[PDB]
Structures are given as structure tokens and as C-alpha cells.
Short mmCIF file of N, CA, C and O in Angstrom, two decimals:
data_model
loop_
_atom_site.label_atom_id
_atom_site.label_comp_id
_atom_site.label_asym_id
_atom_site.label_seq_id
_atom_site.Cartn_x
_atom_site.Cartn_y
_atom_site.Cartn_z
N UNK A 1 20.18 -12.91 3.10
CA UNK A 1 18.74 -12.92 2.87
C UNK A 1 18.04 -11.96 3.82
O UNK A 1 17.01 -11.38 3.50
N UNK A 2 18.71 -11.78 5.16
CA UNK A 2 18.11 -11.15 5.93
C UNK A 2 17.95 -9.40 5.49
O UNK A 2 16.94 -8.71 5.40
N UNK A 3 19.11 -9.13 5.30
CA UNK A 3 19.51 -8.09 4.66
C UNK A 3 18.45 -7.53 3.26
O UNK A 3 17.73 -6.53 3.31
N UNK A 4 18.59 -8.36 2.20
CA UNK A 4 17.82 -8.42 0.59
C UNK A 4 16.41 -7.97 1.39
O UNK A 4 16.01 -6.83 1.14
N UNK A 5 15.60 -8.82 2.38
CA UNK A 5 14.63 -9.13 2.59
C UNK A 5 13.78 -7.40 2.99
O UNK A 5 12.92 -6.63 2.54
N UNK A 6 14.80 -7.55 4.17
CA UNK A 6 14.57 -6.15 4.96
C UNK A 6 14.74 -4.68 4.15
O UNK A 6 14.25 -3.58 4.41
N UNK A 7 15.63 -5.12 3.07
CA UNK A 7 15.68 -3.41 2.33
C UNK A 7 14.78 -3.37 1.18
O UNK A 7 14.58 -2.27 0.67
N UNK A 8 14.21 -4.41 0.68
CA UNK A 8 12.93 -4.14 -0.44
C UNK A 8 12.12 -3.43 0.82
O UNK A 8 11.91 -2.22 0.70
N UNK A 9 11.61 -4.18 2.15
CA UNK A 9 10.31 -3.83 2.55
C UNK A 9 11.24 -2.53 3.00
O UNK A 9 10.77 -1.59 2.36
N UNK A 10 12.03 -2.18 3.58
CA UNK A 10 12.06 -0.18 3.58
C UNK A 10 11.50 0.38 2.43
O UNK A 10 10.63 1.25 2.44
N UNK A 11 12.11 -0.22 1.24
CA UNK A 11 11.51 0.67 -0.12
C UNK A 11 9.59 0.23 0.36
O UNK A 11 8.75 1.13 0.49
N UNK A 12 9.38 -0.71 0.48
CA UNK A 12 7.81 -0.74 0.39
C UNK A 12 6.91 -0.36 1.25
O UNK A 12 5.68 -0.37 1.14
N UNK A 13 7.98 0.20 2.64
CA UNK A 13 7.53 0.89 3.72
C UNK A 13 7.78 2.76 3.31
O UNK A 13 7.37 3.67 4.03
N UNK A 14 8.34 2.88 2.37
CA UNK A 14 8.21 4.24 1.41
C UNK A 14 7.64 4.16 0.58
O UNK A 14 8.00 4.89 -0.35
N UNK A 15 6.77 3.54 0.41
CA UNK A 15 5.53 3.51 -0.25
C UNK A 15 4.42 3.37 0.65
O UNK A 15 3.30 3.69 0.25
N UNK A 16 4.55 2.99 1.65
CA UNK A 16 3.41 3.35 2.81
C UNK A 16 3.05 4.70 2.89
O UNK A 16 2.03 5.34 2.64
N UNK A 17 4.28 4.97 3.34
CA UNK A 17 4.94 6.44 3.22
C UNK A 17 4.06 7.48 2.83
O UNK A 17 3.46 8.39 3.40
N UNK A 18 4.24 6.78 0.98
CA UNK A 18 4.06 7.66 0.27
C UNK A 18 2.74 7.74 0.46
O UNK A 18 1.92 8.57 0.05
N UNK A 19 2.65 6.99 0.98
CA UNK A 19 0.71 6.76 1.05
C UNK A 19 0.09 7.58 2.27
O UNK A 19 -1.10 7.80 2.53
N UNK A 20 1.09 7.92 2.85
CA UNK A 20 1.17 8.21 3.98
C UNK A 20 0.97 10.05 4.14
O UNK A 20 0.20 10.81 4.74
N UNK A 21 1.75 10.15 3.52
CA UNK A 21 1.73 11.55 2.80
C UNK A 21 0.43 12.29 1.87
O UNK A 21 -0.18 13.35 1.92
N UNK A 22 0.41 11.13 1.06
CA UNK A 22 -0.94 11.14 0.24
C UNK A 22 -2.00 11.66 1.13
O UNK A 22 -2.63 12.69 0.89
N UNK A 23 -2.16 10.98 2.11
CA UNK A 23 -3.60 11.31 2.90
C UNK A 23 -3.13 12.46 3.97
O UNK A 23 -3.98 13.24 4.42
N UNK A 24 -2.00 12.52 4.29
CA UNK A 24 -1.66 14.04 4.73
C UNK A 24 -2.70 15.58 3.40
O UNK A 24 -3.74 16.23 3.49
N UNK A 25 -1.98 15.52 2.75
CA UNK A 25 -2.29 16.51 1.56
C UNK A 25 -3.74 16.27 1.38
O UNK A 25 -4.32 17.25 0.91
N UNK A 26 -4.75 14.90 1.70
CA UNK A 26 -6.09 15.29 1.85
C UNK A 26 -6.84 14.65 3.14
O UNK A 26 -7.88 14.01 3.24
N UNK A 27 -5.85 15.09 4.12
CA UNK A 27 -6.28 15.26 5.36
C UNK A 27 -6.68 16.61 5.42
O UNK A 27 -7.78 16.86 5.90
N UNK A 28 -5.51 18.06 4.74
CA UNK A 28 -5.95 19.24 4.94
C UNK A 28 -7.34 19.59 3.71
O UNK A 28 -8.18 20.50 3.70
N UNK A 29 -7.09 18.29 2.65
CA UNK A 29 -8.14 18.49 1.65
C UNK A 29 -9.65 18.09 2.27
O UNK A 29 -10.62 18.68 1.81
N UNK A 30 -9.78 17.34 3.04
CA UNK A 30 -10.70 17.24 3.95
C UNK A 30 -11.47 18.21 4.98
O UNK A 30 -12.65 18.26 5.34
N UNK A 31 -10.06 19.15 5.40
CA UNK A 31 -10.31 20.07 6.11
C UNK A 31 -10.56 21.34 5.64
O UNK A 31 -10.83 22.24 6.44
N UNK A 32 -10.49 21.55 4.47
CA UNK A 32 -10.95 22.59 3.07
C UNK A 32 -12.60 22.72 3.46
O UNK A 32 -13.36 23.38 2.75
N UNK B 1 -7.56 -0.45 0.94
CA UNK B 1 -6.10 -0.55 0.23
C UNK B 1 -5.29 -1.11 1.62
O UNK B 1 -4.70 -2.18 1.77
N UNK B 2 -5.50 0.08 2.63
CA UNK B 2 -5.06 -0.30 4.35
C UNK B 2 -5.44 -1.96 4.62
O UNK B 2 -4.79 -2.93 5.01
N UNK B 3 -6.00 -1.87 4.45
CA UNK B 3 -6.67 -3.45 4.99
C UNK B 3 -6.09 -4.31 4.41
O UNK B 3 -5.86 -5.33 5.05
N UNK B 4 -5.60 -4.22 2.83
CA UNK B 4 -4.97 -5.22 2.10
C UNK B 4 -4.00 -5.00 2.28
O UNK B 4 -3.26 -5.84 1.76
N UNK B 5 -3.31 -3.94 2.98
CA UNK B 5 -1.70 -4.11 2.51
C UNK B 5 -0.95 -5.01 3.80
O UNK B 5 -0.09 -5.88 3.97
N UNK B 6 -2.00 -4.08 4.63
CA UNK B 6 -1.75 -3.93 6.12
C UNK B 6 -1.66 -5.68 6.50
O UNK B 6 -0.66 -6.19 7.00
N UNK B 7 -2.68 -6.29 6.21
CA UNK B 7 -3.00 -7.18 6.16
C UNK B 7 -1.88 -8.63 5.63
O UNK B 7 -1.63 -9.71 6.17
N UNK B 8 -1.39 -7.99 4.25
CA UNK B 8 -0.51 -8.79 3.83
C UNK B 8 1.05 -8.73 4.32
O UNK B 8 1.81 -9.69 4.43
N UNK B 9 1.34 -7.24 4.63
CA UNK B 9 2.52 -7.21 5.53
C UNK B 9 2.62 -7.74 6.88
O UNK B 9 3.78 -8.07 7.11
N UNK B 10 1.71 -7.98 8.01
CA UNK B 10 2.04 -8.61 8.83
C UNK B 10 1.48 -10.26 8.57
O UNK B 10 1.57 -10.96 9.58
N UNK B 11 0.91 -10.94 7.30
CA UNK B 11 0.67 -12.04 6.59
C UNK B 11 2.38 -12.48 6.21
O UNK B 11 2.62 -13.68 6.04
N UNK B 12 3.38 -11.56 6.11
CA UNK B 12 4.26 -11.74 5.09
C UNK B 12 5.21 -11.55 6.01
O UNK B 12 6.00 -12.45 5.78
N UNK B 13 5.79 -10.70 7.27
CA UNK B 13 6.40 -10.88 8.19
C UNK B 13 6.77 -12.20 9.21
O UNK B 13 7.66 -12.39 10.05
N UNK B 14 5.89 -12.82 8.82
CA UNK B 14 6.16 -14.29 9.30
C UNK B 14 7.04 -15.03 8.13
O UNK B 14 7.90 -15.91 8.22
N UNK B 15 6.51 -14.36 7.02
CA UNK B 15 6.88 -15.47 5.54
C UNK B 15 6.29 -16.24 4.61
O UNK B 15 6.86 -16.91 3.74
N UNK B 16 5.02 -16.11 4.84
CA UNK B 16 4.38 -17.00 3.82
C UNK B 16 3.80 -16.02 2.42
O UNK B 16 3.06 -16.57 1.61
N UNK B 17 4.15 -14.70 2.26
CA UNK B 17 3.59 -14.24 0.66
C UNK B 17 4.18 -14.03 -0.15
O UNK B 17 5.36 -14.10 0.18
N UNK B 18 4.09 -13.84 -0.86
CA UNK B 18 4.41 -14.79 -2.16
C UNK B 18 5.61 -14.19 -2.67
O UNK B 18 6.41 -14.92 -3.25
N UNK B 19 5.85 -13.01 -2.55
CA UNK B 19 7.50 -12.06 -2.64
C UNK B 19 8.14 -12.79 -1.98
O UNK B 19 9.05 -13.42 -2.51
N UNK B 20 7.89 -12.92 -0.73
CA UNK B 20 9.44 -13.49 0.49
C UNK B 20 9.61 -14.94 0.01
O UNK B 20 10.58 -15.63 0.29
N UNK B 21 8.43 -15.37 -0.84
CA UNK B 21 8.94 -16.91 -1.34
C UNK B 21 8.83 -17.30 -2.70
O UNK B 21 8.37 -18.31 -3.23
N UNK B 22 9.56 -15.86 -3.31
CA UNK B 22 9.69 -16.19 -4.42
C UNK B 22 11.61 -15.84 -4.47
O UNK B 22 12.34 -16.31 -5.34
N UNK B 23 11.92 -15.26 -3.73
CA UNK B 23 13.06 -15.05 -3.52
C UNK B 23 13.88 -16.06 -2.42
O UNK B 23 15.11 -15.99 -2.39
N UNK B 24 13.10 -17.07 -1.45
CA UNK B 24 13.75 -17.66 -1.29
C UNK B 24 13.90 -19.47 -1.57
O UNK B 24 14.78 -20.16 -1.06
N UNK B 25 13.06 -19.86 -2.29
CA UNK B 25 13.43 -20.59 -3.42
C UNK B 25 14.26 -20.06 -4.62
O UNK B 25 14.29 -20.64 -5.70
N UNK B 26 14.91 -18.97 -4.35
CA UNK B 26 16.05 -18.62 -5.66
C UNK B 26 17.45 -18.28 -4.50
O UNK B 26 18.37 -17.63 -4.99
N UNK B 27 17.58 -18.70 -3.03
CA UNK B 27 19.01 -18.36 -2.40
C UNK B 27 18.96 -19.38 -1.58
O UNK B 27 19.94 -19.48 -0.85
N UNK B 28 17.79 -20.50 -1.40
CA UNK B 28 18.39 -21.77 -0.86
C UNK B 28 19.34 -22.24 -2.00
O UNK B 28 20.49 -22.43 -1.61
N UNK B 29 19.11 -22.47 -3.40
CA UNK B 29 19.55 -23.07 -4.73
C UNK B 29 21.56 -22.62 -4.28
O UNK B 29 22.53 -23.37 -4.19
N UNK B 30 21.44 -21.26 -4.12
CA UNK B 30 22.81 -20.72 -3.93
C UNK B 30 23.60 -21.39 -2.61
O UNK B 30 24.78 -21.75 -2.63
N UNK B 31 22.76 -21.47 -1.56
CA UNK B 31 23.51 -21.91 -0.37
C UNK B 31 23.66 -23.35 -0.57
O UNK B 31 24.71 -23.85 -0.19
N UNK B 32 22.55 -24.29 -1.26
CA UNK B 32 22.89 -25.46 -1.79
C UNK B 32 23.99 -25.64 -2.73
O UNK B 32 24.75 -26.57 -2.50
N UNK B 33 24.20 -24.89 -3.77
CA UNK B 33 25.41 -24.86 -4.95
C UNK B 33 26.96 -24.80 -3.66
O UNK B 33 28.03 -25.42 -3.73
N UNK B 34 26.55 -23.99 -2.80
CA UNK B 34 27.93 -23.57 -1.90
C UNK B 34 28.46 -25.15 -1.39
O UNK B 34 29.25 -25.88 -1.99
N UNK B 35 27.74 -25.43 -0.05
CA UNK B 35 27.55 -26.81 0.39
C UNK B 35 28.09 -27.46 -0.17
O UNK B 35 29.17 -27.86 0.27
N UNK B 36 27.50 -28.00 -1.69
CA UNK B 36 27.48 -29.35 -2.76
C UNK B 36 29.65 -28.85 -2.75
O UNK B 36 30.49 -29.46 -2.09
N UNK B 37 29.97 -27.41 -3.86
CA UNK B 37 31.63 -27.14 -3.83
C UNK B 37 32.49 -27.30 -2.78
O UNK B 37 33.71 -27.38 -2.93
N UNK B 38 31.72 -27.35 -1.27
CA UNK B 38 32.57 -27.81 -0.21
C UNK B 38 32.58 -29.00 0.05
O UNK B 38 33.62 -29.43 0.54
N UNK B 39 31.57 -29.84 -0.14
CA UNK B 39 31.76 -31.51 0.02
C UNK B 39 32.80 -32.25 -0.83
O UNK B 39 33.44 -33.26 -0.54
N UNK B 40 32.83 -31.38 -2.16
CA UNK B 40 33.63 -32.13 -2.96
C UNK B 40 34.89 -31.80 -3.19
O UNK B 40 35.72 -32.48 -3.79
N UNK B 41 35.09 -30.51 -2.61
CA UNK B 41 36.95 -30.49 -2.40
C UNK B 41 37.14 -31.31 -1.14
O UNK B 41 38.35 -31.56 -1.10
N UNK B 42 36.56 -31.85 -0.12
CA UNK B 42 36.67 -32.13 0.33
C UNK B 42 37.19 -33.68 0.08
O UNK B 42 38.29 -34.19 0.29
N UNK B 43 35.63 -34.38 -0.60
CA UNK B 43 35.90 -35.61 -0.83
C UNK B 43 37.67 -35.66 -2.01
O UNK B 43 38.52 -36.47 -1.65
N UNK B 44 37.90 -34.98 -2.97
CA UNK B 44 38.94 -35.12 -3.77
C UNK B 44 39.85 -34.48 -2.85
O UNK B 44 40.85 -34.30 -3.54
N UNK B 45 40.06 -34.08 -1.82
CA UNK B 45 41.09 -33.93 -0.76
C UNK B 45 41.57 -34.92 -0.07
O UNK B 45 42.75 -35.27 -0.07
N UNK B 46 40.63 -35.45 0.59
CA UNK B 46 40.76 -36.98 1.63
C UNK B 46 41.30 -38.31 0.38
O UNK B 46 42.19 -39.06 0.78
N UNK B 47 40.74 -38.55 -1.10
CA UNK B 47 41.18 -39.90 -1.54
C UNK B 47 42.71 -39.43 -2.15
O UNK B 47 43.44 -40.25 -2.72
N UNK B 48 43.06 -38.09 -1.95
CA UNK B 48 44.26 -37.99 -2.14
C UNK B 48 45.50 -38.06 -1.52
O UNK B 48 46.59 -38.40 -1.97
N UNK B 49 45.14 -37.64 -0.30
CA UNK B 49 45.80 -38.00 0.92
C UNK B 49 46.11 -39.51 1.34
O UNK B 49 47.02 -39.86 2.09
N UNK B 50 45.11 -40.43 0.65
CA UNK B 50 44.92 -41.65 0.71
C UNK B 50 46.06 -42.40 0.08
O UNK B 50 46.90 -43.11 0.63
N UNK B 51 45.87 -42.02 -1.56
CA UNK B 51 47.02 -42.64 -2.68
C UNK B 51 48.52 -42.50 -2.59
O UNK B 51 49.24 -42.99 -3.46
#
């Protein structure tokens, strides 16, 4: 369980991520 | 979005939302099924040893 538990939230911590990234690309869109 | 997620991941790091307990009401059932197959080779082990 510990295991199951911890590797969904990596996938959902790559989706932070991705979110993460997201506001990278309009961090410089900000800075436009 | 931050606020909600953020929010629910350290809400959910303890254990109480609703993913981490929807999955573990489905692997107590398994560690219970385990348990229950070891009590009972057990018990039909011991009244055999008996006869």
C-alpha cells in the first residue's frame, strides 16, 4: 500500500509539474 | 487551483481524501482474505494432528 500509494501521487506530483511548467511558459508570457 | 490542490494534498498526506480511502477499503478486504486462509489451515492442521 505504501508503495501503490506513493507512485500514483509521483504521477500527480507530474502533474504539479506539469502545472509547473505551464506557468514557466507564462511566466516569460508575462514577461512579453 | 494552488489553493485547492495544495490544500488537498497536504489534507490527504495524513489520509483522510477520498483517493487514499477509496483504495484502502479495497486492500484491508485483501489482507483480511490473507489472515481468514491462515487461520484455517491452521485450524484443519491442529484437529488433525488430534485424530
Amino acid at each position: 500500500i505504501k508503495l501503490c500509494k506513493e507512485r500514483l501521487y509521483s504521477s500527480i506530483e507530474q502533474k504539479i509539474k506539469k502545472l509547473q511548467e505551464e506557468r514557466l511558459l507564462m511566466d516569460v508570457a508575462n514577461v512579453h | 487551483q494552488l489553493v485547492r490542490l495544495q490544500t488537498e494534498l497536504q489534507m490527504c498526506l495524513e489520509g483522510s481524501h477520498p483517493e487514499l480511502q477509496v483504495y484502502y477499503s479495497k486492500i484491508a478486504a485483501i489482507r483480511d482474505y490473507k489472515l481468514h486462509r491462515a487461520y484455517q489451515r491452521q485450524k484443519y492442521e491442529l484437529s488433525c494432528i488430534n485424530t
